[PDB]
Amino acid sequence: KLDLHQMTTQDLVALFAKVTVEQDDALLGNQISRFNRLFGVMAEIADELKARDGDQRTALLSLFEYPNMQVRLQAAKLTLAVAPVKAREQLEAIVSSKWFPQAGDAGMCLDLLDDGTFKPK
User: Would you list the DSSP string of 81-98?
Assistant: TT-HHHHHHHHHHHHHHT
CB atoms within 10 A of CB 25: 15
Contact, 94 vs 103, CB < 8 A?
yes
C-alpha to C-alpha distance for 86 and 120, rounded to whole angstroms: 14
Regarding the domain delimited by 6-116, which CATH topology (the fold level of the hierarchy) does it fall under? 1.25.40
- Please state, in angstroms and as integers, the Cα–Cα distance from residue 120 to each residue in 6, 45, 78, 100, 112, following that order: 26, 17, 9, 24, 11
Contact, 104 vs 96, CB < 8 A?
no
List all residues 6 or more positions away from 75 whose beta carbon is below 8 Å from its beta carbon.
16, 20, 60, 61, 63, 64, 66, 90
List phi, psi (to 5°) of 107: -60, -50
Please report how the helices 9-28 and 69-77 are oriented relative to each other, as an axis angle in degrees rounded to 10. Answer: 120
